[PDB]
Design a binder for this molecule. Structure first.
Ligand SMILES: *[C@@H]1O[C@H](CO)[C@@H](O[C@@H]2O[C@H](CO)[C@@H](O)[C@H](O)[C@H]2NC(C)=O)[C@H](O)[C@H]1NC(C)=O
Ligand SMILES: *[C@@H]1O[C@H](CO)[C@@H](O[C@@H]2O[C@H](CO)[C@@H](O)[C@H](O)[C@H]2NC(C)=O)[C@H](O)[C@H]1NC(C)=O
Ligand SMILES: [Ca+2]
Lengths: 566, 156, 78
């Protein structure tokens, strides 16, 4: 194929629509793409293959509201991109050297390599999670890593001459890739080697220090954030109210504003739940509500209008697609959960019942935890702290996996221990279903942390624990001996070993995963209102009341990118 | 100065400054091939602890705000009518629970004299919150910090 | 590494610094393999073209642990 392309043949004259549909027709059978295409043709009841089925497979196999160009262009119902779609065919078929040749022969190469990496590793996940598809997943991850390092090398050769061209090449509209950039193609692909490259990181620093000097510290931004008249001496700009609006346009300034006003919010929420959250009564003024709780209502309404703004400012047009893009990160799950739990608590605020207000204060006092879980994204600005947060997230995945084994042994020993201490048809009966079930759950759990109930389970302390059966009084130390040698020593250190394996896997790439989540931090603070940190709701009022280039400039971009690829 | 508070501050400051003289003593152990590298390990692990302490304090103060807010509702009969014991309880009780000193008799409403009258709906919720805090902090966060220390140990 | 206005080429710079570390260690080793007393008196010279500081002081400014852990520097420190 390479020899044909470099002796007498061009893809522009060779490939047509029927050759391409036939090329997707005689895929061999040991691939992932034949089960995917036959599953999609089973969903449409069409016996022949066309490019709309291939396009829908590519759209569900890229994700993130990707729109494949076979569905929108009339040439797929000469061809515009013959190198690109024969390349995509060779990538879907898991053909190493053929996709290499078609990548080397085609235009927009790092975008092609990042799309190939996303497509191959999402085929790897698809073959791993489906039993009707042959698990060739390690081959697909190796091929995706091969396109990862090809994209990183093309970016590196672009970076070794005229870095400004690299920064403006990473943010191009790519009309043959559903109008998304190389940054967005890389973070869809989770290509951590591409984002941790120096070009993407200085670009995220330019976007992060938006029209402002790249080494201005956080305390200068802090003292200029609440004193705008002091912006003019010390804030250095990379080129009047132009300097003011360019100071507040920085996502780092919006970040420091979110940090300081959020610490004010957490201190206010803590003052409410720890010092003043009274029972509602219509007798005294304002219902008895302290105005710190009113300012609390104001700032959580501000966070709610903030999340409604983030839902409305999503790049798709349909509201369901905006919701699907909005819930693509877990931070929006934490946001919607904390806001909904707050709104439930403040609905239950006003009912004057003792149980309903008790539920309200309990729900609010447990929702401070979820606001501080939302606070955890702030620590991703630090090279040292953010990887530890990624460690915490993957260890919580490990804990949610191990917790069924831990609960199985815990409930087994709890059933045994409570059955030998408290025989229920006897004088030693706990005549209460709830304290029996919570004892089975509770007592092995606290014994698991070395809080040994040795006085309790041997028959002493009969008032606050219970009258233990006298033959449970000698058997309970033996059962607790087996449980301590099996659970505190073996099971817990097994879980610690799982956590340490997770620690080593993240710590060997901690720098690169911080570089990758730095993109998510920049995108989190790039779309915030350009406004005062106590007045961001006024900013949402004043909202209520990725670059494109010239076509000859785009062809010049493509020529420079293709020769750096050469 | 013969004042009771000023002399108390003097003896407290002297009795805490013996610690810093013995921190200065730590350079003597660099004459040993075996001990001095362990002191370099202690120094880099204290750097690691000073980095991890903001994450540990964030989760500690979160659970402390939650725990003290469910045990002691401040506009109620179960109010701790003292700002200082509230703030030091939020700092203090998750910290000692983090080392397995579980205040299970205290947070379930028993020992009302030296701990405080716990609200009866905090008496069942405090073991659940402490369960989540023990499975998240003594198991996950502390062994994460131990893993950081072990990575530092291997590097040195 | 600590400045954002400077391109982070830091790993290349640490590799180049380690390259000069092992070059210095090898020159000290070839100095040590004949007449060790000359190595000890060479490590403590006034170096007027280096602001009058020794090879020991240039190495501990550089934190060149491979140079100080060489046998010449250690018997000199003994
Ligand atoms: C739980 O209920 C059982 C059932 O009545 C109690 O068992 C009785 O206890 C008395 C004195 O303790 C004996 O005289 C009876 O013979 C027991 N009945 C049976 C069927 O064994 C038991 O004491 C209760 N336990 C608690 C803690 O309330
Ligand atoms: C803290 O102060 C509050 C405010 O007075 C006390 O709450 C009162 O307690 C008495 C009896 O305990 C009740 O009769 C009142 O109705 C309560 N007032 C309110 C507004 O709820 C509370 O007892 C004090 N707690 C401590 C430990 O001193
Ligand atoms: Ca959000």
């Amino acid at each position: 194929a390479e020899l044909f392309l470099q002796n007498g043949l061009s893809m522009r004259e060779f490939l047509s629509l029927d050759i391409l549909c036939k090329l997707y027709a005689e895929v061999p059978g040991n691939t992932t793409i034949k089960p995917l295409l036959q599953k999609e043709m089973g969903k449409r009841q069409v016996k022949t293959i066309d490019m709309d089925v291939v396009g829908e497979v590519i759209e569900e196999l890229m994700g993130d509201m990707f729109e494949s160009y076979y569905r929108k262009d009339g040439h797929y119902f000469p061809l515009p991109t013959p190198y690109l779609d024969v390349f995509l065919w060779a990538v879907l078929c898991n053909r190493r050297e053929l996709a290499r040749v078609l990548w080397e022969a085609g235009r927009e190469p790092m975008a092609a390599a990042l799309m190939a990496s996303r497509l191959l590793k999402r085929m790897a996940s698809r073959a791993q999670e489906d039993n009707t598809i042959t698990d060739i997943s390690s081959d697909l991850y190796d091929h995706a890593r091969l396109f990862e390092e090809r994209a990183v090398g093309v970016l590196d050769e672009c970076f070794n001459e005229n870095e400004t061209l690299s920064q403006t090449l990473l943010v191009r509209e790519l009309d043959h890739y559903s109008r998304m950039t190389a940054l967005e193609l890389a973070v869809s692909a989770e290509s951590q080697d591409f984002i941790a490259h120096t070009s993407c990181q200085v670009l995220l620093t330019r976007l992060w220090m938006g029209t402002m000097a790249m080494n201005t510290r956080w305390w200068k931004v802090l003292v200029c954030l609440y004193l705008p008249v002091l912006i003019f001496p010390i804030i250095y700009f990379v080129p009047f109210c132009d300097r003011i609006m360019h100071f507040y346009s920085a996502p780092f300034s919006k970040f420091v504003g979110n940090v300081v006003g959020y610490l004010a919010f957490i201190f206010l929420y803590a003052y409410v739940v720890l010092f003043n959250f009274p029972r509602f009564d219509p007798a005294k003024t304002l219902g008895g509500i302290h105005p710190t709780e009113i300012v609390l209502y104001f700032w959580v309404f501000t966070i709610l209008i903030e999340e409604i703004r983030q839902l409305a400012a999503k790049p798709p047009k349909y509201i369901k697609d905006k919701v699907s893009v909005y819930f693509s990160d877990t931070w929006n799950f934490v946001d919607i959960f904390s806001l909904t739990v707050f709104i439930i608590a403040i609905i239950l605020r006003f009912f004057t019942n003792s149980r309903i207000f008790t539920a309200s204060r309990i729900i609010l006092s447990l929702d401070i935890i979820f606001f501080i879980v939302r606070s955890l994204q702030i620590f991703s600005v630090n090279r040292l702290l953010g990887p530890k947060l990624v460690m915490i997230q993957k260890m919580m995945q490990d804990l949610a996996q191990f917790i069924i084994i831990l609960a199985v042994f815990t409930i087994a020993y709890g059933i045994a221990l409570h059955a030998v201490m408290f025989p229920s048809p006897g004088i030693y009966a706990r005549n209460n279903t709830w304290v029996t079930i919570t004892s089975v759950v509770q007592y092995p759990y606290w014994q698991m942390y070395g809080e040994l109930f040795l006085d309790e389970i041997q028959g002493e302390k009969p008032k606050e624990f219970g009258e233990v059966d006298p033959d449970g009084r000698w058997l309970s130390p033996l059962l607790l001996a087996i449980y301590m040698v099996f659970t505190n020593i073996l099971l817990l250190n097994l879980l610690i070993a799982i956590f340490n394996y997770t620690f080593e896997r993240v710590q060997e790439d901690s720098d690169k995963v911080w570089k990758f989540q730095r993109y998510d931090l920049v995108q989190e603070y790039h779309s915030r209102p350009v406004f005062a940190p106590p007045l961001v709701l006024l900013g949402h009022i004043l909202i209520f009341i990725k670059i494109g280039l010239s076509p000859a400039e785009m062809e010049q971009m493509d020529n420079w990118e293709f020769q750096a690829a050469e």
